[PDB]
Curated annotation (Swiss-Prot):
Enzyme class: hydrolase
Notes on activation and inhibition: Inhibited by vanadate. Inhibited by micromolar levels of bile salts, such as tauroursodeoxycholate. Not inhibited by taurodeoxycholate. Not inhibited by hydroxysterols, such as 7-hydroxycholesterol, testosterone, dexamethasone and prednisolone. Inhibited by EDTA and EGTA.
Cofactor: Zn(2+); Ca(2+)
Note on how the cofactor is bound: Binds 2 Zn(2+) ions per subunit. Binds 1 Ca(2+) ion per subunit.
Chain residue ranges for the region called Nuclease-like domain: 541-805
Protein name as it appears in the record: Autotaxin
Length: 805
């Protein structure tokens, strides 16, 4: 209950919220039913529309007008954006030539370049090229400023998740906005696009930019714009705020457009009806820039033109129904559309079996347009598991499709031709970034990056210290003319031990066998050189990874590979090896099929044992350095060390063997050598972070040998592939993956066929950034290179997506 009897007289778009029930005059007042009685009359004037015409020039001020063409208007800060153009023969900003902004050119009293974030809903990355002919203002920003070919949104590629990620630098699983539609089982409450529930602050975690700014003495404009406030009024309001006195004036502003998303849904992404929404947005941008130029701020303000997600072709008829797969379909609740999330219709039901539901949705139709997943088995690159609002069962839907529970949901809710929300690697979901202003670079193209990185940059642009977030600060330094942040490497916490030969064969009782005994003096200096690190410059190209937590671990050198062997987990944390373009693949000889060999540098008590694997009927083993890529029969023996062994499900060994026997060599042939770092990952509580040993839920039966949830590899080579990986003078090229360590291959519907038809497809789905692997291992890679740290940070955030162009 309000008493909306107060006035908005002199308080239109006031910047501080006033507390109940003395009434309100700000964007949110609409949404709360709390506007003063005279809000529309005073604050949302429309009279005479939004453009000066020559006949209004010098007019006598009429305070009813939407905007002003009177002589006093620049001082009052309320001219129509085109005032100078119409009434003073000035040029539109877009018609001016691009001139480098080497320094901020700000009015007296401006302590810092303001930041304006101009966000556009559903603005697909390819619109920059495909609609360039009707967006001249946007094209000027893009070509004159800093731009990426695209920006990667977060999953799901929906509006609120991506807008709140822009604002916080956090993954949805961390900020809490995991969908445009959510059920929180603790609140027993649903968040939806319509309704008041979405306004409760309990949904919104993390620290958004406007709060970071306010806590550190920097004022912010509104970020939320009521849908009924027209765009012309949003721009005018931002420009009026910018004319405030120095002590009152915000330093950070946002504009938001519902277009082009709104039309895109109706007409599809490239429907002929889309040309006009693009024209309209461009004109808004023109308004803002003409407004800035009037206020002499057009070479002072940093402008970010950014999208939340793209748009794909999606029609009613491309709908998969769960009623076609399940008998029991009236027992579940589905969050439907371009993703699926399934939970039990009734919490009072231990007669709900996720496994039966998954099984009924797996590889059931040859052409099935969705794939079910327990959330912990989703590609780790999506970071979409660690929140109670994310249901245990998830459906990843194919681009261009929808999922629904029953047909009646689709005609008793055709309408739409476009939608979004698919996997964030999908080309159609990619969106836009341009930065323009004194702090951004001039006429510069940067590589595509993820939207989680922007919070840090926006904080830099405003001299703020970012709250803790999922960006890698320094990874986007290359966007900026002048950086206030100088990243440095994290310090190594645990130093390795370098053990020599300390144990006799007979001290081991590991239950292992190997056929390995066959009697030269100059090649027993040579083997000792290898165990000492003589080849380490070849196999460890970028320094040893730094261990960033307290543990006990040993560096082990070998002719063909180096490892960091954990005495706690009883297996390598990491194993590094270089495979040249010329290298040969060989088999595991017959006599060495079951060979495992005690490592005389490591105590029986810190070693795995073969008996455990014998007794564990589910669990087998693999090797991190592959025996198949041994440099010589003699070096091959090293690959069968117990210290190179790791626990693997037989089903997983199909994947791993194919990767080690076939794919490594292919990549070395295509990339002119590769360096490989492989290792285990433990993330039993699916938080994206390295587990402590007291969090492991599975061990090889009757042992202390922990079972990894995933296995990673980082495959690095020279960006200039005319140089071999091991003699690379310049920038690097990386691809990586985090493969789920699963006792079945149900994820891959063709897994009954030869590995050549499905393994690589699986691996591509589980593509990862180096940074993802860092979070999951507490390791820090690329410690010793010839490259700047900023560049290395960019490299560690790279994701190889395996999309077309
Ligand atoms: C991406 O970046 C983010 C941001 O940096 C990383 O997220 C951080 O992860 C940290 C480590 O996991 C985590 O630290 C914990 O903080 C607890 C304090 O929590 C409150 O205060 C802060 C600060 O202002 C606040 O941000 C928190 O935010 C959550 O609160 C609610 C959740 O209901 C949401 O509104 C909000 O979105 C956010 O939710 C998200 O995080 C929570 C966990 O915090 C998840 O469960 C949600 O699903 C969601 O993802 C809080 O409001 C603090 O209490 C913890 O301390 C315990 O654990 C340490 C471990 O070493 C231990 O030493 C202590 O003993 C302590 O133990 C006691 O508690 C245990 C656990 O409850 C208990 O079992 C023990 O027996 C003890 O009693 C912990 O330090 C930090 O909160 C988040 N920040 C955010 C915003 O999420 C994320 O890791 C990055 N991602 C990647 C992939 O790198
Ligand atoms: C630029 C920006 C705009 C935003 O809100 C815009 C908006 N206005 N009106 C609506 O009806 C839809 C959403 C937001 C949120 C988090 C407040 C949603 C964040 C960010 C960022 N960074
Ligand atoms: Ca959107
Ligand atoms: Ca974990
Ligand atoms: Na076994
Ligand atoms: Na399968
Ligand atoms: Zn939309």
């Amino acid at each position: 209950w309000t008493a909306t009897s107060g006035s908005c007289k002199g308080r239109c778009f006031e910047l501080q919220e006033v507390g109940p029930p003395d009434c309100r005059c700000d964007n949110l007042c609409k949404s709360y039913s709390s506007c003063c009685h005279d809000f529309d009359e005073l604050c949302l004037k429309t009279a005479r529309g939004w453009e000066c015409t020559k006949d209004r020039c010098g007019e006598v001020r009429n305070e009813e007008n939407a905007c002003h063409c009177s002589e006093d208007c620049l001082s009052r800060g309320d001219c129509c954006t085109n005032y100078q153009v119409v009434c003073k023969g000035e040029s539109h900003w877009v018609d001016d030539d691009c001139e480098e902004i080497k320094v901020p050119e700000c009015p007296a009293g401006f302590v810092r370049p303001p930041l304006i974030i101009f966000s556009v809903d559903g603005f697909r990355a390819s619109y920059m090229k495909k609609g360039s002919k009707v967006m001249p203002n946007i094209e000027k920003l893009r070509s004159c400023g800093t731009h990426a070919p695209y920006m990667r949104p977060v999953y799901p590629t929906k509006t609120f998740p991506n807008l709140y990620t822009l604002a916080t630098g956090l993954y949805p699983e961390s900020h809490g906005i995991v969908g445009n539609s959510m059920y929180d089982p603790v609140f027993d409450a649903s968040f939806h696009l319509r309704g008041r529930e979405k306004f409760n602050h309990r949904w919104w975690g993390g620290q958004p930019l406007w709060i970071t700014a306010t806590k550190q003495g920097v004022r912010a404009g509104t970020f939320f714009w009521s849908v009924s406030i027209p765009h012309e009024r949003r721009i005018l309001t931002i420009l009026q705020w910018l004319s405030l006195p120095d002590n009152e004036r915000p330093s950070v502003y946002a504009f938001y457009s519902e277009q082009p998303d709104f039309s895109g849904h109706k007409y599809g992404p490239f429907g002929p009806e889309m040309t006009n929404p693009l024209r309209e947005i461009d004109k808004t941008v023109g308004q803002l820039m003409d407004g800035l130029k009037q206020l002499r701020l057009h070479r002072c303000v940093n402008v970010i033109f950014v999208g939340d997600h793209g748009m794909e072709d999606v029609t009613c008829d491309r709908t998969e129904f769960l009623s076609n797969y399940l008998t029991n379909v009236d027992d579940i609740t589905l969050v439907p559309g371009t993703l699926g999330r399934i939970r039990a219709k009734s919490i009072n039901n231990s007669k709900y079996d996720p496994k039966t539901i998954i099984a009924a949705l797996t590889c059931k139709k040859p052409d099935q347009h969705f794939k079910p997943y327990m959330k912990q088995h989703l590609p780790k690159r999506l970071h979409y598991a660690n929140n109670r609002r994310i249901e245990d069962i998830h459906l990843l839907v194919d681009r261009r499709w929808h999922v629904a529970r029953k047909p009646l949901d689709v005609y008793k809710k055709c309408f739409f031709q476009g939608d979004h929300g698919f996997d964030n690697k999908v080309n159609s979901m990619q969106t836009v970034f341009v930065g323009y202003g004194p702090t951004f670079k001039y006429r510069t193209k940067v590589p595509p990056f993820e939207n989680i990185e922007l919070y840090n940059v926006m904080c830099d642009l405003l001299g703020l210290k970012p709250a803790p977030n999922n960006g890698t600060h320094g990874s986007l330094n290359h966007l900026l003319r002048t950086n206030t942040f100088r990243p440095t490497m994290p310090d190594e916490v645990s130093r390795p031990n370098y053990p020599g030969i300390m144990y006799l064969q007979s001290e081991f009782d590991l239950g292992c066998t190997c056929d390995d005994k066959v009697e030269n003096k100059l090649e027993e200096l040579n083997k000792r050189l290898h165990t000492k690190g003589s080849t380490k410059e070849r196999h460890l190209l970028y320094g040893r990874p730094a261990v960033l937590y307290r543990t006990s671990y040993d560096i082990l050198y070998h002719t063909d590979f180096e490892s960091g062997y954990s005495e706690i987990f009883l297996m390598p944390l990491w194993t590094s090896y270089t495979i040249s373009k010329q290298a040969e693949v060989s088999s595991i000889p017959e006599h060495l099929t079951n060979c495992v060999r005690p490592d005389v540098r490591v105590s029986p008590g810190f070693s795995q044992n073969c008996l455990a694997y014998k007794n564990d009927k589910q669990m087998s083993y693999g090797f991190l350095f592959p025996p198949y890529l041994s440099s010589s029969p003699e070096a091959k023996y090293d690959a069968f060390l117990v210290t190179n062994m790791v626990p693997m499900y037989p089903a997983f060994k199909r994947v791993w063997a194919y990767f080690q026997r076939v794919l490594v060599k292919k990549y070395a042939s295509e990339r002119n050598g590769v360096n490989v770092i492989s290792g285990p990952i433990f993330d039993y509580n699916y938080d994206g972070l390295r587990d402590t040993e007291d969090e492991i839920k599975q061990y090889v039966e009757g042992s202390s040998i922990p079972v990894p949830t995933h296995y990673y590899s980082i495959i690095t080579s020279c960006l200039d592939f005319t140089q071999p990986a091991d003699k690379c003078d310049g920038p690097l090229s990386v691809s990586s993956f985090i493969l789920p360590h699963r006792p079945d291959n149900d994820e891959s519907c063709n897994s009954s066929e030869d590995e050549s038809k499905w393994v690589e497809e699986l691996m591509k789905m589980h593509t990862a950034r180096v940074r993802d692997i860092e979070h999951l291992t507490g390791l820090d890679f690329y410690r010793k290179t010839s490259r700047s740290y900023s560049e290395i940070l960019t490299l560690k955030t790279y994701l190889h997506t395996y999309e077309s162009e």
